[PDB]
Amino acid sequence: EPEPQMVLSPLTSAAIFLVVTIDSGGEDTVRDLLSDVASLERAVGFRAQPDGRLSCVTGIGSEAWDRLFSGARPAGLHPFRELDGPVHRAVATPGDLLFHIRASRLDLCFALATEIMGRLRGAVTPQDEVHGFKYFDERDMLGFVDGTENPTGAAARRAVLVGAEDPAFAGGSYAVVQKYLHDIDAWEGLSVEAQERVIGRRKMTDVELSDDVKPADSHVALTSVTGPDGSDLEILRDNMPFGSVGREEFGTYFIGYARTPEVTETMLERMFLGTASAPHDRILDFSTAVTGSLFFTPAADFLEDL
Amino acid sequence: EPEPQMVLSPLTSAAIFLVVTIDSGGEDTVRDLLSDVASLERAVGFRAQPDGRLSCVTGIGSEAWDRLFSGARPAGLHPFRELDGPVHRAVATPGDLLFHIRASRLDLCFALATEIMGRLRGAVTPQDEVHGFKYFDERDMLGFVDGTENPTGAAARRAVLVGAEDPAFAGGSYAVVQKYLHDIDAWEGLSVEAQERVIGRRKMTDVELSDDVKPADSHVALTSVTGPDGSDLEILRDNMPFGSVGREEFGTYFIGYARTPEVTETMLERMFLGTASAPHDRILDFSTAVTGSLFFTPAADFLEDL
Amino acid sequence: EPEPQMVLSPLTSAAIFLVVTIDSGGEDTVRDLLSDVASLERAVGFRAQPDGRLSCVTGIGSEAWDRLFSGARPAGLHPFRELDGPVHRAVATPGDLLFHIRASRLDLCFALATEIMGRLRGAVTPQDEVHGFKYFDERDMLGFVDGTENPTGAAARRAVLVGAEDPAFAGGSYAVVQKYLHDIDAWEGLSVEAQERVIGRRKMTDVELSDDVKPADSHVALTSVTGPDGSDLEILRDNMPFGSVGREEFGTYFIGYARTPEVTETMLERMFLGTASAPHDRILDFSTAVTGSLFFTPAADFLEDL
Amino acid sequence: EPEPQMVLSPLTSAAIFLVVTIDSGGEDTVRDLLSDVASLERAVGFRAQPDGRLSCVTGIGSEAWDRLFSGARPAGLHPFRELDGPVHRAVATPGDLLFHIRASRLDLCFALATEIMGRLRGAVTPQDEVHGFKYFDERDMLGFVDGTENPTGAAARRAVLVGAEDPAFAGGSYAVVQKYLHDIDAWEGLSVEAQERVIGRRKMTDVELSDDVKPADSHVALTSVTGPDGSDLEILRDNMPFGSVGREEFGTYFIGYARTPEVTETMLERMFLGTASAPHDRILDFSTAVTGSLFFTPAADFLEDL
Amino acid sequence: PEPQMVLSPLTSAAIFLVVTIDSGGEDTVRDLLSDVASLERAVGFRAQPDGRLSCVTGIGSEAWDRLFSGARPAGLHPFRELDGPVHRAVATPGDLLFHIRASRLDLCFALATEIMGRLRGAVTPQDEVHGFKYFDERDMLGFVDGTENPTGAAARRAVLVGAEDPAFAGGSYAVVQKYLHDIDAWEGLSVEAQERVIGRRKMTDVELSDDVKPADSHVALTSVTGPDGSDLEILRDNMPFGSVGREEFGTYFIGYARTPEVTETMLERMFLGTASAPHDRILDFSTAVTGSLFFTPAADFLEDLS
Amino acid sequence: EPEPQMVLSPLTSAAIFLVVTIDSGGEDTVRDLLSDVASLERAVGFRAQPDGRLSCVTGIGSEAWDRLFSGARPAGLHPFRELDGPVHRAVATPGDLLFHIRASRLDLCFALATEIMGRLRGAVTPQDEVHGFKYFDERDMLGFVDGTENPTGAAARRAVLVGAEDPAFAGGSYAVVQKYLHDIDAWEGLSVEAQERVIGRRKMTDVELSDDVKPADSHVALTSVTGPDGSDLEILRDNMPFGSVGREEFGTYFIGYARTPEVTETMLERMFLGTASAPHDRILDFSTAVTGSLFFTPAADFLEDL
Ligand code: HEM
Ligand code: HEM
Ligand code: HEM
Ligand code: HEM
């Protein structure tokens, strides 16, 4: 009845992230593609069963939603909110549609992106394209294991999927994306122990620092948030490394899924604006966000029903 | 909760299909084998975990049911209905038991089949034995990706498993088998574009032709059927290639699972007898059915407790 | 609702079994460690996604429970009961905590064990440590496939997890461990046929001997038990081989999970004390138990909510 | 500098053996296929780099040689010699061309066999086609590890490749094929220890029996032959299991390569005709030859030069 | 003389880096060249045995004169621009080539990062391409690409400098060209028409017969026979690359040869044509946007530098 | 040409090191086993083709050589020379035979060791048995990638095989073994930067430290040796981690192969006794040798010919 898209699925060794804007007069072409995206994913993906693990998660931005559909909107859908901190800024950049494409091989991702874009040619303008790759033992460009504390099982379901709070849109999710570029030269000037105090975990072994030693402005400290009832508010991250050596571009493509954007936005506010105990997240002293967009990823049957 | 046999499990790289008839006075031997087939599957399969993926699905034909069992019969169980179209015919051939054996390796299939047939020696007569193999990127002998639109998840369960409409047999399914031989000489004389018009999908990329270009007598058009309620009727297919180059035998072994045989039967009727828009399915111009049988595959517990 | 530990997960190619006692005054250090074991499991295991398959099952013994926790006790928790047969004895040995660590590679097991033992230094005393390895096609040191008749799916859940009969501890299980050393010299003086009569299955093919020829004092005969309800009583076994060639140590590390210890204890009594028709299990003529301990493995959330 | 065909390559998981005779008028078609066979092998094989390991060895029989080529003949090429022993017979059957096709997957073998036979349609009559498969840990249908004592490295080159003794044909080899069908019922009536005596090695562990225990009519004893120079005479065997359970067809497809047919013929004589100390090879009491043919497999460059 | 890894096969990932040496950057580059093999080992050893990381370093003609004082490789000269009537092969700056391959992109990226870290401020990047395997060794035109590469001793003879230039024995010459394809134009051809452009069957990769193969097909024009009569061969490690948003669908051409004359002869035939052919038809769908020639010295040459 | 044992082959994921002494009177049994060790290796190893990678290198100590054999001895065969430094000592411990067993899986190593020791029972006394395992990305227990600068190709052959300097023993090698235990508590007290100064390489990335920063008492500095004629003296190391968590045993099993013990001894003297610039190798401040033995590993044909 409420079949979600593959928002709960694990990290893979390859990804493509595509973000586009819909041109004036391109809505009908988009709606037609949306109704077919599941068929296209199967068309390509079936060629590589059992090990291909191809998926595509399609998201739709707030303004786009109003152009495409009449009737109810998801309760939490709004444009990404720019955060202008005293030192660091989280920019909002244009994006109407997100395609988060994952597989165990880049070819599958590329083949599917080709089919999607082929259908949208002349109706959309590309805003961003990133080809992500796994880096060693699930490391990011800063050299730390990245994704460790993601929720799993029932916990992930509860953290990520819209439920009875917005019944018309149950099985959907909200995705926030941000493309970060790192200052690798600066970061490499820190000792490993200083890097560990920025993140909040040991570098090689990935063991969390004890509470008596973890700084209040470490990344793990600032992105740990408790809800009304003492429980952790969780998001599901599918961050991937990307880059270009000749351009000195060493990045993290951030994508986080959550059942309400309020959770992800709380984490961002703490990072960028800081708290009474932390000026800002120290990870931002080595990381610049160059995109920022929010999407709603509907249940799969919503897109079919078109 | 009734425990199904492995009728929902995916395609594998190797398969053995075995169809036998039960000789007069063979019933007791067969019943004792039926009660042991799961333990035989584990005895062989356990040797190859975790990657062996050995399974065996056992089906029983309509006439055999009546020789083996007193009491309730599955509601949809009848002999395969011969279809004598104007040009093409779907023959009915004898078969009392089906063993649908799958694994990631042929040795495991062969070892299990050996143990089964050793127990049935003198009680059964073999009618058909086919050793199927994966062909490139999930292709069939016509060079097309085959299996793409199979249901998955909840949809597959709904489509395949008997439920409350026949509660004594909940968790069962119906399998139809047909062995097809292809005229490869004739097929390979067609252009790719002509072959695509026969199937209804692009050959290399496996993308479905749009509705405005897809012929009414293409295979995909004829095997797409909407139910009374406008709901699509679905089957689960585990087709495998087979052949012998020296005898010019290039085959598709068709096996389709469904909650009721009426669904599969409607598809065959459309293919063999045609519609208002189509004389018959053009695939049949290059494919000849040489067997045809219908089996019920009971819930696993049913076999266990007999 | 309650999340079990990974007690239902399959065999892997590597394991570490670590049994320790809690030293006088070690209680608080152990409680802090128990609250963090899942975190540690993730810290190490995430590095090896997706194929590492690291898990850790943590068990607590009867005496230790009382030292660590106030309030309710699991209903079936008691010290391992020594069985002093006429010929063979099942010894009870000290053990307060069990860590059953599994992965597809030993390095992941060793890394996690290192992190747990580093946190427990000064608070526990090691009692046994075994590094298990897969031996050919899931064989044990006697040369027989080992694990074949383990329950799977729903039958496993039913057989292993505590439910509404003890609702405060639902999602838990009971583990019994015994380290066995084999007399391989004596074993290898037996013909294959004689070995088959000891075990109750064919050696190469792992097919069960038929009821006609299966000895009453065979291993499989004695460990096949039914309730007064008539159903099979099942346990889940994760036995691993281990050894040292220079010391002539050829071993089977037995670990069996069950929803109540009574099931496993019944099997042990049949083995060591025999039945009307069998003096004891013949496997014990070639196998000596040198440890014996019983643990409760709580639901995951019990440990966390510490 | 002559380039051999892939006669020194290892065993693979899948094989196809194809034997055909050349029809009246078929010689030109055959010579054109021979000139292209390496190019066909690449055409198919490159699709599955790095792991497909596709190869084709092409052999030519004695009578066919003379129909296809003028000028010199290989020194040792003659028709297979039938051996009519007092109990068992090594039969000779027709065969002009051999294709020995190997890969890690059957699809590659089948695709190459399809391209080959497509070229040859109307010029050849198929005599035999077998699809071989790996059986557990390099076992044959008798349950023994099969291939152990094959030569490797320098020793294999010396044993298999024609050298200065026949310089115009240096880089070639001689292949003897025999299809054997086994009496599995008779074989399984022997204890394992009796089977071990027949073969001359331990069944499970593959360790050779000591000289003190090994019978003179054991298979290993009879196929161990020393030359006049005290030199061990060696062949390279690529035999594969095959079968059909319904037909009770459990087979060994024997293929042995050697630098001269006299080595292989000596072994056959010892097996079928026996020695002073053994009437015949006991393996033949459970194994019946139903084909026998001898081929020369030229250097790769010889075929290309056509 | 130890060659660099120019004979090694295709891998699933590659990075191609081309840089120019800034005025005054010569000493830094010499230093790096002396260390490139130690960097390769430093990264590569981490992923033994399946990483397959390699780096081949090439030096252009102008750079050679700037870096070294002694003799020049006899064939070393700037890439020769070809201005054909319709199509042009452009010559673009490039002093150093790093051709980095592995089974995973992370290893490629890590090594590139270390190389470029050492060169920062001494070199200017000219081109960086991240190549990926596309299905069954296909290129962006949908054809299997690499089939007729030489192997074994033929590859060695075709690719490595020998006695004809003894001071440079073990070296090779690499030509690179980055090509972008007009996929829209290409996809408007029938498959049959595309086959006539290439000269091989699309799906099966079988060469067209010499009757059917057009004179202006790519295979016909790149098939070159020397005075001798024997085929002139090169070794190609072409990789796909692209960007879907930018409509960039590319083939990164790299071809290795013992003398540049061979590759240059093929280029002349393609762009300038022959008696029979105005130009290679593949160029109607393919534009070269880079063109550079490099000498890749023996490994000992680079190790022995100041 | 003498055929070496597998002394040049790469590191594997699993290893067993077995060191025994020969009891008085066990010489004949030992000689018989030495003549069979290659047959035993094949017997087990063939079961796991193609990926088992099982090998066994057999070494003989100086005192043992003189008990087993008569006639000429290898020129550099002597007992391990104890090194009594001011601070650190390298002990000499008994060992007459070494079996260095490697495979991709421990079961294969264990099965072969079982067969070898089965044959030697009652003739030998075990002295050491270590079961080594790969640790992450080729790391040792100190957390550094270990094996990076091993020689490969021709350089490896030159460094490790006896040649014309001792022609009767050409194709042999010398192995030195030392079992090291590490003081992990002390090591973990160092910053990563301080550990890098002890080793001489970067910890995560395995890049060698610059010659300006690399300390003179770093491990890499002291084990880098040039000969009188300017050549680098190299050894081939197949070190493996081992340990036991409950005993707080974290080790490195050192094994180095070289064509003369003089190279390995020179390295050891520099480490333990120091140089004009370094008191001793800083690695020894965290590593204690607990065994030390020297073996000659003869050419394979020497063993076979006994
Ligand atoms: C510059 C970009 C980023 C990098 C390189 C990065 C890296 C990391 C690393 C290494 C960890 C620790 C291991 C783990 O549990 O994944 C972590 C944890 C986490 N990150 Fe980030 N991160 C980035 C941006 C973000 C952003 C933008 C958010 C939220 C809006 C976020 C939310 C989190 C959360 C919730 C955790 C888990 C904290 C916990 O409960 O322990 N991260 N990240
Ligand atoms: C010496 C230690 C042991 C060895 C080497 C061993 C070996 C085996 C083998 C080879 C089988 C047959 C294949 C399979 O179903 O797993 C088996 C079955 C079994 N074993 Fe054991 N076992 C040992 C100890 C135990 C112990 C201590 C128990 C219980 C307390 C146990 C309970 C079982 C059960 C329940 C079965 C399945 C019987 C059936 O239902 O068919 N085993 N074991
Ligand atoms: C757009 C750029 C190119 C593409 C997509 C391309 C594609 C192909 C394909 C599909 C084949 C047939 C299969 C094979 O043998 O690899 C082929 C063959 C070949 N190509 Fe190209 N190629 C390109 C550029 C070049 C260039 C620039 C050269 C030489 C300077 C070249 C030399 C060859 C050679 C020598 C063969 C083998 C011909 C034979 O002996 O059958 N290619 N290429
Ligand atoms: C105590 C335990 C030992 C440890 C943990 C260890 C560890 C290491 C490490 C991490 C490296 C750097 C990476 C590489 O392998 O190239 C290295 C290099 C080396 N080690 Fe050791 N080692 C040990 C003992 C020894 C011994 C006893 C010797 C010689 C007798 C030795 C000889 C070498 C050599 C020759 C190199 C390469 C130096 C170079 O040319 O860069 N090691 N070792």
Distances A55 to A108, A112, A254, E106 between C-alpha atoms, Å: 9, 9, 18, 22
CA distance linking residue F16 with residue F110, whole number of Å: 7
Q: Is F207 helix (H, G, I), strand (E, B) or coil?
A: coil
Kindly state whether A48 is in contact with chain B, defined as any CB-CB distance less than 8 angstroms.
Answer: yes
Q: Taking a C-beta distance cutoff of 8 angstroms, is the pair A11, A238 a contact?
A: yes
Of E9, E136, E207, the CB nearest to D47: E136
Q: Is C17 helix (H, G, I), strand (E, B) or coil?
A: strand
Asked if residue F41 lies in contact with residue D192, where contact means CB atoms within 8 angstroms, the answer is no
Known catalytic residue: A32? no
Q: Is the dihedral of CA F41, F44, F48, F52 positive or negative?
A: negative
Determine the 3-state secondary structure of C100 from DSSP. strand
Phi (first) and psi of residue B79, to 5 degrees = -60, 150
H or E element that contains D17: strand D14-22
The chain B residue lying nearest E203, using CA atoms, is: B204
Which atom of ligand 3 approaches the CA of E140 most closely?
A: 5
Cα–Cα distance list, B30 to A226, B34, B176, C202, E285 (Å)? 62, 6, 21, 22, 64
Q: Cα(C82)–Cα(C41) distance, rounded to whole angstroms?
A: 33
Q: Tokens 């006991």 sit at which residue? A: D282
- Evaluate: CB of F283 within 6 angstroms of ligand 4: yes
Cross-strand pairs, B109: none
Q: In chain C, how long is the greatest CA-to-CA distance?
A: 58
CA distance E191 to E202: 7
Q: What tokens appear for E257 in the block?
A: 């040869």
Proximal ligand: closest to the CA of F292: 4
Residue B149, token pair as written in the block? 């639109």
Q: How far is the CA of A195 from the centre of ligand 1 (A)?
A: 14
Q: Contact at 8 Å (CB) between C109 and C103?
A: yes
Q: How far is CA C187 from CA C192, C200, C282, D196, F188, in A?
A: 10, 15, 11, 18, 47
Q: Is the CB of F44 under 6 A from ligand 4?
A: no
Q: What is the spatial distance between Cα B124 and Cα B23, in angstroms, rounded to a whole number?
A: 5
* SS3 call for C297: strand
The kind and range of the H/E element at A65 are helix A62-68
Rounded alpha-carbon distances, angstroms, from residue B153 to A3, E225, E238: 9, 58, 40
* Interchain CB contact of A136 with E (< 8 Å): yes
Structure tokens at F233: 């003296």
- Please tell me the experimental approach by which this structure was elucidated: X-ray
Q: Which residues of A203-227 are buried (b: 16+ CB within 10 A; e: fewer)?
A: bbebbbbeeeebbebbbbbbbbeee
- Name where chain F breaks: residue before each gap, C-N > 2.5 Å: none
Kind and range of the H or E element at A264?
helix A261-273
Closest CA to A1 of A114, A167, A176: A167
Residues of F in contact with C247 (CB under 8 A): 126, 129
Q: How far is the CA of A54 from the centre of ligand 1 (A)?
A: 25
The one-character DSSP state at A81 is P
- Greatest alpha-carbon span in chain E: 58
**Element of type H or E holding D221:** helix D219-222
Q: Which two tokens stand for residue D228?
A: 């006049």
Residue E186 has, within 13 A of its CA and on its CB side, a CA count of 21
Calculate how close chain B gets to A154, using CA atoms only, in Å.
18
DSSP C116-161: HHHHHTTTEEEEEEEEEE-BTTTB-TTSSB--TT---HHHHHHHHS
* Site of tokens 């495991």: B108
- Looking at all shown ligands, the one closest to residue C261's CA atom is 2
Cα–Cα distance, E141 to E249 (Å, whole number): 9
Ramachandran angles phi, psi of E190, nearest 5°: -70, 160
Interface of C with A in 25-44 (CB under 8 A): 39-40, 42-44
- C55-60/C89-90 β-pairing: unpaired
Cα(D190) to ligand 2 centroid in Å equals 27
Q: Give the Cβ contact number of residue E222 at 10 Å.
A: 21
Q: How far is CA B82 from the centre of its chain?
A: 16
**Distance of alpha carbon A114 from its chain centroid, rounded?**
21
Residue B117 structure tokens: 């047939």
Nearest CA to C213 out of C234, C199, C227, C223 is that of C199
E-strand spans in chain F?
14-22, 55-60, 83-84, 89-90, 97-103, 124-133, 173-182, 225-226, 232-233, 236-237, 240-244, 249-258, 287-289, 293-297
Query: Rounded CA gap, E165 and B121, in Å?
Result: 74
What residue spans of chain B are helical by DSSP H? 27-34, 37-45, 62-68, 106-120, 153-160, 184-188, 192-199, 219-223, 261-273, 300-304
Tell which residue, A254, A133, A166, A172, has the closest CA to residue A7.
Answer: A172
For atom 35 of ligand 4, the residue with the nearest CA is F223
Contacts of F107 (CB under 8 A, 6+ apart): C133, C134, C135, C136
Q: Rounded to whole angstroms, how far apart are CA atoms C90 and F11?
A: 42
CA A99, A102, A103 angle in degrees (round to 5)? 150
Buried b (16+ CB within 10 A) or exposed e, D102-113: bbbbbbbbbbbb
CB burial of E128-148 (b: ≥16 within 10 Å; e: otherwise) equals: bbbbbbbbbbbbbbbbbbbbb
Q: Which residues pair with D208 in a beta bridge?
A: D201
A129: its two tokens: 């394209």
Ligand 1 center from residue A287 Cα (angstroms): 12
- Residues of D in Cβ contact (< 8 Å) with C203: 192, 204
Contact list, B194 vs chain E (CB under 8 Å): none
Contact B102, B9 (CB under 8 A): yes
| Domain range summary for chain F, segments of one domain joined by + | 14-304
CA distances in angstroms from D40 to C70, D36, D105, E200, F241, listed in the order given = 76, 6, 17, 12, 48
What's the DSSP call for residue A122?
T
Closest CA to F25 of F67, F57, F69: F67
Q: Which helix (H) or strand (E) holds A132?
A: strand A124-133
For residues D127 and D120, is the Cβ–Cβ distance under 8 A?
A: no
Q: With beta carbons less than 8 A apart as the criterion, state whether E148 and E203 touch.
A: no
Chain F CB contacts of E42 under 8 Å are 148, 201, 205-208
Count of other CB atoms within 10 angstroms of residue F241: 25
- CA dihedral of E286, E292, E298, E303, whole degrees rounded to 10: -120
Nearest to F253 by CA among F17, F77, F11, F14: F17
Breaks in chain A (C–N > 2.5 Å) following residue: none
* Tokens coding F262: 């003089």
User: Would you state the structure tokens that stand for residue F146, as one six-digit string?
Assistant: 């270990």
Nearest-CA residue of chain B relative to A115? Answer: B207
Distance CA A68, CA A23 (A): 12
Residues of F in contact with A143 (CB under 8 A): 204
DSSP letter at F103? Answer: E
| Helix C192-199 and helix D192-199, axial crossing angle in degrees, nearest 10 | 150
Residues β-bridged to residue A158: none
CA D30/CA D26 separation, integer angstroms: 6
User: What is the identity of the amino acid at E273?
Assistant: G
CA distance C63 to C21: 10
Q: Which amino acid is it at C178?
A: Q
Sign of CA dihedral B109, B110, B111, B112: positive
Nearest CA in chain D to C139: D204
- E181: nearest Cα among E130, E241, E271: E241
Say if the Cβ atoms of F206 and E43 lie within 8 Å: yes
Residue nearest to atom 37 of ligand 1 (CA): A149
The residue with tokens 């991937």 is: A240
A225 CA: nearest ligand 1 atom: 40
User: Quick one: which ligand is closest to E137's CA?
Assistant: 3
CA distance A293 to A88: 17
Tokens of E292: 């550079």
3-state secondary structure of F172: coil
Are the C-beta atoms of B72 and B305 separated by less than 8 Å?
Answer: no
SS3 content of chain F, % helix, strand, coil (to 5): 30, 25, 45
d(CA D23, CA D29): 10
F with B: touching (≥3 Cβ pairs within 8 Å): no
User: What is the rounded CA–CA span in Å between residue A201 and residue A212?
Assistant: 13
Tokens of D128: 């035999």
* F148, F199, F220, F285, best to mutate for ligand 4 pocket (most atoms within 8 Å of CB): F220
As a whole number of angstroms, the distance between CA F256 and CA F237 comes to 4
* Atom 32, ligand 2: residue with shortest CA distance: C223
Q: What is the largest CA-CA distance in chain D?
A: 58
Quick check: do C and B touch, 3+ CB pairs under 8 A?
A: yes
Phi, psi for residue D136 in degrees, rounded to 5: 50, -135
Percent helix, strand, coil in chain C, to 5, is 30, 25, 40
**C270-306 exposure pattern, b = at least 16 Cβ within 10 A, e = fewer:** bbbbbeeebebbbbbbbbbbebbbbbbbbbbbbbeeb
The experimental resolution of this structure, in angstroms, equals: 1.7
CA E216 vs CA A212, A235, E209, E265: distances in Å: 75, 58, 14, 15
Residue E277, SS3 per DSSP: coil
Residues of B in contact with A42 (CB under 8 A): 148-149
Q: What are phi and psi of D163, to 5 degrees?
A: -125, -140
Q: Yes or no: say if F12 and F53 are a contact pair by the CB < 8 Å rule.
A: yes
Whether chain F has a CB inside 8 Å of the CB on E306: the answer is no
**Which residues sit opposite C145 in a β-bridge?**
C139
Question: Which chains contact A through at least 3 pairs of Cβ atoms less than 8 Å apart?
Answer: B, C, E, F
Q: Which chain C residue's Cα is nearest to F125? A: C246
E146 lines ligand 3 (CB under 6 A): yes
Helix E105-119 crosses helix E26-44 at what angle (to 10 degrees)? 150
Q: Return the ∠ at Cα F139 (arms to F133 and F142), rounded to 5°.
A: 105
Proximal ligand: closest to the CA of F147 = 4
* Cα C189 to Cα C88, C137, C184, distances in angstroms: 21, 23, 9
Q: Pairing state of beta strands E235-236 and B287-289?
A: unpaired
d(CA F172, CA F260): 10
Measured CA to CA, the distance from residue A268 to residue A280 in angstroms comes to 10
Backbone phi, then psi, for D17, in 5-degree steps?
-110, 125
Alpha carbon distance C217, C232 (integer Å): 18
Backbone conformation region of residue B144, classed left if phi is above 0, alpha if psi is from -120 to 50, else beta: beta
Sequence letter at residue A173: S
A with D: touching (≥3 Cβ pairs within 8 Å): no
Q: Torsion angle, CA of E41/E45/E49/E55, rounded to 10 degrees? A: -30
Tokens of D31: 């010579």
First to last CA, chain B: 18
Helix (H, G, I), strand (E, B) or coil at E213: coil
| DSSP single-letter state for residue F40 | H
| E-strand stretches of chain E | 13-21, 54-59, 82-83, 88-89, 96-102, 123-132, 172-181, 224-225, 231-232, 235-236, 239-243, 248-257, 286-288, 292-296
The residue of F245, F247, F250, F291 whose CB has the most chain C CBs within 10 angstroms, and thus the best one to mutate to test that interface, is F245
Atom of ligand 1 nearest to the CA of A264: 30
Q: Is the CB of C240 under 6 A from ligand 2?
A: no
Alpha carbons A31 and A124: distance in angstroms, whole number: 12
- Among C298, C301, C239, C256, CA closest to C58: C298
What count of residues does chain D have? 306
Looking at the DSSP bridge assignments, the partners of residue D14 are D103, D133
A199 membership: H or E segment, kind and range: helix A192-199
Residue D289 CA to residue D305 CA, distance in Å, equals: 36
CA separation for the pair B241, B141 (Å, rounded) = 6
CA-based nearest residue in chain A for residue F205: A143
Q: Which residues contact F79 (CB under 8 A, 6 or more apart)?
A: F61, F62, F63, F92, F294
